[PDB]
Ligand binder design. Structure first.
Ligand SMILES: O=C(Cc1cccc(Cl)c1)Nc1cncc2ncccc12
Ligand SMILES: [Cl-]
Lengths: 305, 297
C-alpha cells in the first residue's frame, strides 16, 4: 500500500555526469562512450544570447578550449560537432560506466526522473512530467544546465531530456538528446513565454484508478458520460482533450477495478464541479496529473483493495 | 526556481542491495564490507528459530552472483550475515538513528533490485507514509552528507492503515512496534510544525507572499493555537534552527508563526502555496536551505 511520486534509481545516470567549461561558463555534460553531450549555449557569452550565431561562435573554437572534468580527472577533447541545440564533444576516453541506453523523444503527459547536477556533481533526483505546453515544472538553479531527464524501464536508460533554460514564470525548457527543443522555444534570450498550461486528463484518470486500487471510492457516482460530453465539460476547466487512444490506454486499469473509462470520466466531471469537500485522494487535496497509466500499473499492486 | 520533493542520488546505495532468501521468504539485504544486514523476520523466540538455521540455509544473491554465508548473528531486530566476499562497491557510511520530523530517501527494492527512490519523513507517531508492496522488506532509508551515506532506516512491515514501520540499522524499531503478526496500530499523528514553517519560507523565497501579514505572536500563544490543530509544539530550538531562513527573507520566525495561525483558522481561500492546497510538513529547514542553494554529492 501507499502511493508516492517515485523516481527511478539514479546510479546508472550519476556515472555519466561530467563538468564542461568553456571560457567563463561552467555547466553539466552527459558522458556516454567517447562522447560528451551538453547544451550548445556553453559557447555563448550572456551578450551572445540575444542573437547568437552558434555556427560562427563554434568555428572559432578549438578542441583545447573545451575543458571536461569527470570527477577529479581531466578528459581530453579530440573533436567537436553540433547537432541542433546540443554540442557533442569527442573525448579520448570511453566512459567505463556507460550503461545500456537509448535516446527517446517523449510526448506531453509523459513522466521522467531528473538528476539535478551542479559542476558535474549530482545533488538530487525528482520525478516530473512534460507539460502539455512543453515546459517542465522543475527545481533548477544557475549551473544546472545540462542536467538530464530519463526513465529506466528494465536495465536500459532512456534519456529523454537535457535542461537548457528557465522561462520568466519559473518553468523550464530544454531538448531531447538529439538537440531538438520540446515546444516552440529557442536557446536565445528572446521574449519567450510558456503557453497557457492545461491539466493532463489521462494522467488524472490513471491516478483516480490508483486511488480505487488503494481502497478509496468516495468520489465515484452512478453516472456515465459520452466522450464528447466529457470533453465539452473538461475543456471548461482547462483540461486536455481525452482521445480514444487515452480511453484504450486506460483499458487495463478499467478491467482491474471494474470501472469503465467513461464511468471514471463521469466521476472526474463531478469532482471538477464540486471540489473535494475537505477530503483528500491519495493524500492530496488537488487532482494529480503527473502519474501516467504506465506509472500507476508499475507502482500499484495487481490486487485491488 | 522550482520546489520539488527531492531525494538524494541513490547510486551509492544501489551498489549495496542484495536478495536474501531463507526457506519460502525472499526479501532485501544491505551488503556493506563482508556483512549483509536484513530484517530478522526472514528466519520466520527468534534466538530459538535462529539456532536451528545453518549458514547454508541463507541464500544471498548480488546481481547474478551467489554470495557464500560463513556466519550469522542477530542484533535487536536485524540479522547480520557474514559473507566470504567484501562488497567492492561499499561506500563511506555510518549507521545513524534519526528523530521524528527528520527526512530521508528510501530506495525501494524487490528481489535485491532497486525499483524506485522517494523522499519521506519520520512522522511524530514514528511511522512513515511510504510506497511499498510484498517483497519490499529490507529496503533502506538514508541521507548523504558530503560523500558519506548515513543509513537510518530499514523497512520491516506495513500497518493496517497503509503506513510503514521499521528499524534503524542497529535493529531498534522506530515507534512502539514489534516484528510479528499481532494487533498493532499507529498512534494519532501530528503535523511537523518546524517543517511547515520551513516550507512557508521556501514559498517566500520562490515568490509566494500572499499569506504574509503585519502581525507577530508570542511562542506561548502560537503553541496554544497549534495544539488545537494537532500540530507539534514549536520549541526555542526550532526557532533558532529557522534563524538563517528568517534572516534571508526578512520575516521573523514569530512573524511567520502569525501567518501559519491565520492559515489554520481561515484556510487557503481557493489559493495554493508552491502548487499545494495543503500545508506541507515533509521538508526540514535544512532541506529548504539545501534545495535553495544546490549542495552536491
Ligand atoms: O536560463 C539559464 C541560462 C540560459 C539563459 C538564456 C537562454 C538559455 Cl537557452 C539559457 N540558466 C538557468 C537554468 N535553469 C534554472 C536557472 N535558475 C536561475 C538562473 C539561471 C537558470
Ligand atoms: Cl512518450
Amino acid at each position: 500500500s501507499g502511493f508516492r511520486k517515485m523516481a527511478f534509481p539514479s546510479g546508472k545516470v550519476e556515472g555519466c555526469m561530467v563538468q564542461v567549461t568553456c571560457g567563463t561558463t561552467t555547466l553539466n555534460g552527459l558522458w556516454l562512450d567517447d562522447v560528451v553531450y551538453c547544451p550548445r549555449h556553453v559557447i555563448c557569452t550572456s551578450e551572445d544570447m540575444l542573437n547568437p550565431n552558434y555556427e560562427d561562435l563554434l568555428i572559432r573554437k578549438s578542441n583545447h578550449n573545451f575543458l571536461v572534468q569527470a570527477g577529479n580527472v581531466q578528459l581530453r577533447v579530440i573533436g567537436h560537432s553540433m547537432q541542433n541545440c546540443v554540442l557533442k564533444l569527442k573525448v579520448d576516453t570511453a566512459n567505463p560506466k556507460t550503461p545500456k541506453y537509448k535516446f527517446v523523444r517523449i510526448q506531453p503527459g509523459q513522466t521522467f526522473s531528473v538528476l539535478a547536477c551542479y559542476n558535474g556533481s549530482p545533488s538530487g533526483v525528482y520525478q516530473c512530467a512534460m507539460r502539455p505546453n512543453f515546459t517542465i515544472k522543475g527545481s533548477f538553479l544557475n549551473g544546472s544546465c545540462g542536467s538530464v531527464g530519463f526513465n529506466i524501464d528494465y536495465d536500459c536508460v532512456s534519456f529523454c531530456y537535457m535542461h537548457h533554460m528557465e522561462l520568466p514564470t519559473g518553468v523550464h525548457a530544454g531538448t531531447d538528446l538529439e538537440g531538438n527543443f520540446y515546444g516552440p522555444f529557442v536557446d536565445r534570450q528572446t521574449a519567450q513565454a510558456a503557453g497557457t498550461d492545461t491539466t493532463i486528463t489521462v494522467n488524472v484518470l490513471a491516478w483516480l484508478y490508483a486511488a480505487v486500487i488503494n481502497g478509496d471510492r468516495w468520489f465515484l457516482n452512478r453516472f456515465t458520460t459520452t466522450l464528447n460530453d466529457f470533453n465539452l465539460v473538461a475543456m471548461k476547466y482547462n483540461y486536455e482533450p481525452l482521445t480514444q487512444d487515452h480511453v484504450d490506454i486506460l483499458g487495463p486499469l478499467s478491467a482491474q477495478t471494474g470501472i469503465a473509462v467513461l464511468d471514471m470520466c463521469a466521476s472526474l466531471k463531478e469532482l471538477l464541479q464540486n471540489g473535494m469537500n475537505g477530503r483528500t485522494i491519495l493524500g492530496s487535496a488537488l487532482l494529480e496529473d503527473e502519474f501516467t497509466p504506465f506509472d500507476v500499473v508499475r507502482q500499484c499492486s495487481g490486487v485491488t483493495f
